[PDB]
Design a protein around this motif. Sequence first.
Motif, PDB file in Angstrom:
ATOM      1  N   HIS A  96       0.860  -1.188   0.000  1.00 56.74           N
ATOM      2  CA  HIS A  96       0.000   0.000   0.000  1.00 56.74           C
ATOM      3  C   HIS A  96       0.894   1.234   0.000  1.00 56.74           C
ATOM      4  O   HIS A  96       1.467   1.667   0.993  1.00 56.74           O
ATOM      5  CB  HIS A  96      -0.937  -0.036   1.208  1.00 56.74           C
ATOM      6  CG  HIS A  96      -1.854  -1.224   1.134  1.00 56.74           C
ATOM      7  ND1 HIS A  96      -2.993  -1.229   0.388  1.00 56.74           N
ATOM      8  CD2 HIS A  96      -1.758  -2.466   1.693  1.00 56.74           C
ATOM      9  CE1 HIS A  96      -3.600  -2.424   0.490  1.00 56.74           C
ATOM     10  NE2 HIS A  96      -2.859  -3.192   1.296  1.00 56.74           N
ATOM     11  N   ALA A  99       1.333   4.054   2.429  1.00 59.15           N
ATOM     12  CA  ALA A  99       1.947   3.760   3.724  1.00 59.15           C
ATOM     13  C   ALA A  99       3.459   3.970   3.691  1.00 59.15           C
ATOM     14  O   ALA A  99       4.087   3.908   4.748  1.00 59.15           O
ATOM     15  CB  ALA A  99       1.675   2.360   4.208  1.00 59.15           C
ATOM     16  N   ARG A 117      -2.152   1.582   9.388  1.00 61.61           N
ATOM     17  CA  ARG A 117      -2.063   0.572   8.347  1.00 61.61           C
ATOM     18  C   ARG A 117      -3.411  -0.119   8.148  1.00 61.61           C
ATOM     19  O   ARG A 117      -4.212  -0.121   9.087  1.00 61.61           O
ATOM     20  CB  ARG A 117      -1.043  -0.524   8.715  1.00 61.61           C
ATOM     21  CG  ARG A 117       0.411  -0.072   8.506  1.00 61.61           C
ATOM     22  CD  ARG A 117       1.362  -1.189   8.892  1.00 61.61           C
ATOM     23  NE  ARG A 117       1.262  -1.486  10.328  1.00 61.61           N
ATOM     24  CZ  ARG A 117       1.733  -2.616  10.858  1.00 61.61           C
ATOM     25  NH1 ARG A 117       2.328  -3.546  10.118  1.00 61.61           N
ATOM     26  NH2 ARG A 117       1.596  -2.802  12.160  1.00 61.61           N
ATOM     27  N   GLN A 118      -3.665  -0.724   6.996  1.00 58.47           N
ATOM     28  CA  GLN A 118      -4.807  -1.611   6.799  1.00 58.47           C
ATOM     29  C   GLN A 118      -4.871  -2.632   7.933  1.00 58.47           C
ATOM     30  O   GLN A 118      -3.808  -3.196   8.247  1.00 58.47           O
ATOM     31  CB  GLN A 118      -4.696  -2.328   5.448  1.00 58.47           C
ATOM     32  CG  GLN A 118      -5.476  -3.623   5.330  1.00 58.47           C
ATOM     33  CD  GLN A 118      -5.344  -4.322   3.991  1.00 58.47           C
ATOM     34  OE1 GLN A 118      -5.563  -3.735   2.927  1.00 58.47           O
ATOM     35  NE2 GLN A 118      -4.980  -5.602   4.006  1.00 58.47           N
TER      36      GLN A 118
HETATM   37 NA    NA Z   1      -1.762   0.163   4.710  1.00 55.23          NA
END
Ligand code: NA
Length: 122
Positions: A96, A99, A117-118
């Motif tokens: 990602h 990030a 973060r996810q």
């Molecule tokens: Na992320």
Amino acid sequence: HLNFTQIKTVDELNQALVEAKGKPVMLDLYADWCVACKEFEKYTFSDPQVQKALADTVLLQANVTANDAQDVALLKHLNVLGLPTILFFDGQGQEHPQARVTGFMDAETFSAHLRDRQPHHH
Ligand code: NA
Ligand code: NI
């Protein structure tokens, strides 16, 4: 010091991602001459808060100090433009880009970044 697993090449990164499948990953790009990289080790990676936050993340590191052909290929493949750069991959192996960290971050700032973060628990 964090317990990183060193990778040298694109192939090696990809195999590490395959084996990490199911846990989130952090890839730190490092060089001995990179001042902010050393600052991450002194002020941030050395902080218990950060260390504990990363305990369920697989930590990978590429040491591109030499800037040899394999280093350059790796950087190019990841579209890295300078050091330090830290990449984050979720537990499905997908990176990602938002990030990415591309400058020094202190422990509180980095910690907060980890938090954003996810989601990654099963
Ligand atoms: Na992320
Ligand atoms: Ni966790």
